[PDB]
Write a protein that binds this ligand. Structure first.
Ligand code: HEM
Ligand code: HEM
Ligand SMILES: CN(C)Cc1ccc(OCc2ccc3ccc(N)nc3c2)cc1
Ligand SMILES: CN(C)Cc1ccc(OCc2ccc3ccc(N)nc3c2)cc1
Ligand SMILES: C[C@H](O)[C@H](O)[C@H]1CNc2nc(N)[nH]c(=O)c2N1
Ligand SMILES: C[C@H](O)[C@H](O)[C@H]1CNc2nc(N)[nH]c(=O)c2N1
Ligand SMILES: [Cl-]
Ligand SMILES: [Cl-]
Lengths: 362, 362
């Protein structure tokens, strides 16, 4: 039933993929080849074309993603050839450099060897390739609370952060055969960071806020035709609200709203003053401003929702069913000002797709 | 099966109601009485206590309502005795006066005779007892687009609005036996309206915005123990976002954001300026300010979400399952600043409850 589930997923994927690629006549022989390859080996190997299209389909099927208009221009890097921790490290370094592209961010995914029989070849521990550490000692919070457990796991392994609010975590991953992961400090020249300033409130820089340029999600599994690529980091560019309404604003993250309110000169005393809302708007304005000023790609939530409307229209024109998760697609500020808020979406799960998987630590 | 569905709903309601009222021992004889009453008459009549508690339970079970902490203090007015259109009119007038309470709004419901065998005794046409008319002729929009079809139905019946942006619709309802509804102009002395001003932007009054004080929803059906009270208008006080983020801001309603942006002195040209968000905040601030200044009850969304957290805690302490509709409970501005956004709710439907029903017009 191992070979059964795989074979069925393979048939459905190959058929759909080859149809979209205008290759429907080659389906028969390809499925024949695959059938034999599974019988003899227990698995099968995607061609470069199948893998690239599979990764693109997986993005197109990501219900929670508002950024999907651009699914077809995903830059897919095939690293199924890596065998060593130095190769993995260098592939991760290269991904960062090529995705960053001097600030003109390229949506990119790097695909490592897939699981064999549930056995991981490479297991990445980072949630994102670039992220800030988090600490707590003596009721003092430092850095990003969302990184607290990974940060403690790294320091167990001999890493030590400087305990600033913005320490970059090391890359950390484990190779098949090894009992422990290894870690590598990120070279600073690879990492673009953006200091947060406001277009017309000069005091805003007193907050000394910054964020990194590129979100490179590295803990999701790509599934394509029954093959499980558990290590396949990918990135887009940020939507400003991710930084301004969540990373910097959530009480369980950097919790900056009261400080923002103070620098923009409003009281943080009464709910009816809507000071949190006002602070959120000014922080989100500062975030868009700062990325644009530095020449780092970013999208605001209005522009993103307009793009998503086009994605919806493109889906209809192509005869493809659209799936989405309304609770994730709506932006966390002014959601009712977007068309998303005013319609519903089918939250069905279609494969290929990206999936959560269990953390190797904690 | 008519009497069957009713009998079953009655047993479930009476049991639950009497348990909460500490009257569990009287359940047996009450169900006996009810059994006979159904057999002989086809229906049964709620006592004053059952009706009042039923209406309160129905509010407590309203998944979409963030205002539910105060479910137990609902003021229930029993008007099952009305037989004439003048009595219905006067009950509706009285509801407005007593709910308004000079601006210190009392959550109130007035309950009219229930459907007999699906036959309505009274059929209210208004969506809310107080609402503004809407018109369109020659591509000119006037007033509230959401009222366009009711407004046209009223004018078909001899009503004529002055075609201001804020014409009050007449009360309109139909009595069993009558082919056509009747309408009655609302006496102005009954209706509190609030002009919208901003606490520190003087030009804001140039918009000449206003809204009415009390939302009195009049087109939902109350169901309690199998009895269908299709005419049972009820009100709370507004949450400010209903007015500022939806009624005055939605493009399909008053569509005021571009005008707000202009009076607060910002450009409405670039999505990255977040001018819609900023305009929304200033409009919502103006709305809270204006109601408070006039002495009309209103709640901001932060305070409302804090109350709802207490409702959740009260539900747990009472051993009652909580139900909610996340997509409706989140406020349309800064939803991620409320605890609601960060948890999930079971959207199961529990009776007693309030339900949508078919419009009698259009
Ligand atoms: C190109 C720019 C992109 C933008 C602006 C964008 C925007 C977003 C946003 C705002 C979220 C919600 C994140 C959160 O609230 O935690 C999201 C979720 C997601 N995006 Fe995209 N995205 C982009 C590119 C990509 C790419 C390249 C992929 C993969 C090929 C991808 C796959 C996903 C997935 C899988 C999720 C959901 C993750 C989860 O369940 O937690 N996106 N996207
Ligand atoms: C006391 C102040 C109250 C506040 C602040 C409040 C708040 C709200 C809000 C903001 C909504 C969403 C409305 C929308 O987006 O269209 C809502 C929905 C609702 N409320 Fe309340 N509410 C209150 C009192 C009441 C009362 C007294 C009842 C009935 C006894 C009630 C029953 C409901 C119902 C049934 C809905 C959902 C209607 C639908 O499905 O469209 N509420 N409430
Ligand atoms: C918080 N973790 C434990 C769960 C978790 C894992 C992946 C997640 O991905 C979010 C995500 C994924 C892809 C994105 C692509 C672009 C973008 N701007 N944000 C993006 C955000 C989110 C949460
Ligand atoms: C738009 N109609 C066609 C459907 C419709 C019917 C009743 C509706 O009730 C909304 C509602 C109900 C009760 C409320 C109580 C208090 C409050 N502040 N808003 C409240 C808002 C909403 C939509
Ligand atoms: C439980 C709750 O629904 C959940 O935390 C969601 C809500 N919607 C969201 N939407 C986005 N884009 N991102 C999130 O992290 C969340 N959190
Ligand atoms: C289709 C869409 O989900 C729907 O229009 C909802 C979204 N959530 C909402 N929430 C509230 N409180 N009120 C509304 O009118 C809506 N509209
Ligand atoms: Cl992030
Ligand atoms: Cl309203």
């Amino acid at each position: 039933e191992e070979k059964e589930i795989l074979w069925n997923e393979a048939k459905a994927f190959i058929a759909a993929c080859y149809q979209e690629l205008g290759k429907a006549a080659e389906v028969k022989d390809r499925l024949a080849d695959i059938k034999s390859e599974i019988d003899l080996t227990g698995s099968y190997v995607h061609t470069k074309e199948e893998l690239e299209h599979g990764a693109k389909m997986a993005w197109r099927n990501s219900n929670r993603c508002i950024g999907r208009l651009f699914w077809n221009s995903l830059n897919v890097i095939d690293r199924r050839d890596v065998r060593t921790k130095e190769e993995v490290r260098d592939a991760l370094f290269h991904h960062i450099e090529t995705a960053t592209n001097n600030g003109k961010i390229r949506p990119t995914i790097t695909i490592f060897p897939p699981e064999e029989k549930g056995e991981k070849q490479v297991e990445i521990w980072n949630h994102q390739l670039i992220r800030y550490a988090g600490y707590e000692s003596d009721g003092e919070r430092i850095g990003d609370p969302a990184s607290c457990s990974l940060t403690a796991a790294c320091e167990e392994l001999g890493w030590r952060g400087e305990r600033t609010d913005f320490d970059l975590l090391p890359l950390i991953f484990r190779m098949k055969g090894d009992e422990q992961p290894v870690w590598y400090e990120l070279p600073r020249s690879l990492v673009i960071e953006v200091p947060i300033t406001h277009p017309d409130i000069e005091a805003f820089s007193d907050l000394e806020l910054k964020w990194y340029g590129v979100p490179i999600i590295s803990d999701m599994k790509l599934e394509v035709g029954g093959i499980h690529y558990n290590a396949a980091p990918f990135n887009g560019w940020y939507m400003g609200t991710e930084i301004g309404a969540r990373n910097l604003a959530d009480e369980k993250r950097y919790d900056k709203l009261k400080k923002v309110a103070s620098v923009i000169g409003i009281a943080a005393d009464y709910n009816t003053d809507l000071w949190k809302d006002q602070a959120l708007v000014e922080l989100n304005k500062a975030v868009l401003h700062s990325y644009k000023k530095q020449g780092v790609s970013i999208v605001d939530h209005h522009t993103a929702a307009s793009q998503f409307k086009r994605f919806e229209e493109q889906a209809e024109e192509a005869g493809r069913k659209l799936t989405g998760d309304w609770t994730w697609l709506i932006p966390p500020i002014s959601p009712a000002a977007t068309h998303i808020f005013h319609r519903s979406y089918d939250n069905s799960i279609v494969k290929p797709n990206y999936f959560y998987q269990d953390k190797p630590y904690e």
